[PDB]
Copies of this chain bind each other. A is one copy, B any other.
């Protein structure tokens, strides 16, 4: 039958390596759900529900035609059951029924990855919106049979909207707020679970001259992202994460429960800012990340300020 291979899965913002196999395999993935309290912002704590200890879950990377076998464990300290719906999976609930797992239990199931693409996976236990809004989502990349083109740098980015009882900035442990969630009025909108998770000392890094690809998911639960990198243009966009390629795009829509792949070349050093360009989200609710690029200046691409005079 098919050979068995253990999956390499990565914590955001890292991405598993490209697959060098030209035949189908049974790829074994282990996942654990963990409820834990973490910092959403300075002085603000939140009780996240997570795949494997953070938001988003770890990235999976398989090849079209693979069978994906999932061993799904719910930590005994969890208060509720959890499960997983893979948008990459064809069949009931994307796997949700087969993976329904009470605290302190393990479920196993498998599915065939019939189509390439970049797929959200998320918990689907009722009330589904709360399980997602507490942070239970990630991406699985299903490569085309021939692979994707080579790039220098790859990053794993997932946007989410969060609903707290207090206003943004209100200190302490902030509970989930169902009324704000139903009204689609989030207090925080973030990349990778937390304000500053990929900014500042957590900034992404590259060098001038390098090609960059970002695997961008939107776990929602509710918002649609107008995704943009300040100071860059997307040379290529895989539209809605599908096969169709657009070029020379400044800002691209990432549907709720959907994805996009964007590619660009960083030509000169600087700090490049990832945003949701519904711009009060970025500068007032947290939807802001950084890519720091080192290397040599090149005035032919962009200069510093050349003069300052009276007007």
Binding site for B on A (CB under 8 A): 32, 67, 73-76, 85, 87-101, 104-112, 114-117, 119-120, 124, 126-129, 132, 181-185, 220-224, 226, 228, 230-235, 237, 239-253, 255-259, 267-268, 270-272, 277-285, 300-311
Per a CB cutoff under 8 Å, which of B93, B239, B304 touches A246?
Answer: B239
B104 near A305: Cβ-Cβ < 8 Å: no
Taking the nearest CB of chain B, how far is it from the CB of A35, in angstroms?
A: 14
Give the docked Cα–Cα distance between A279 and B242 (Å). Answer: 21
5 shortest interchain CB distances as A-B pairs: A91-B302, A257-B277, A251-B258, A92-B270, A226-B255
Copies in the complex: 3
Chain B residues near A105 (CB-CB < 8 A) = 308-311
Contact A277 B255 (CB under 8 A): yes
A253-B240 contact given A90-B231, A106-B310, A106-B311, CB 8 Å threshold? yes
Within 8 Å CB of A284, what residues of B?
A: 127, 129, 182
Which listed residue (B111, B119, B252) contacts A250, Cβ 8 A? B119
Q: Which of A73, A100, A117 has the most CB of B within 10 A?
A: A117
Q: Which residues of B contact A232 (CB under 8 A)?
A: 90
Known contacts A88-B233, A91-B268, A278-B221, A99 near B305 by CB under 8 Å: yes
Do B92 and A256 touch (CB < 8 A)? no
Check if B220 sits within 8 Å of A279, measured CB to CB: yes
Give the distance in Å from the alpha carbon of A233 to the alpha carbon of B87 in the complex. 7
Selected A-B contacts with CB under 8 Å, 29 pairs: A87-B233, A87-B251, A88-B233, A90-B231, A90-B233, A93-B270, A108-B305, A111-B301, A112-B302, A115-B248, A117-B248, A117-B249, A120-B250, A129-B279, A221-B278, A221-B280, A222-B281, A226-B256, A240-B246, A241-B250, A242-B248, A243-B247, A244-B245, A244-B246, A249-B258, A251-B257, A251-B258, A252-B258, A258-B277
Known contacts A129-B280, A222-B279; is A249 also within 8 Å of B253 by CB? no
Give every chain B residue within 8 A of A181 (Cβ-Cβ).
280
Say whether A98 contacts B305, CB under 8 Å.
Answer: yes
Whether A306 and B226, one on each chain, are in contact in the complex, defined by CB atoms closer than 8 angstroms, is no
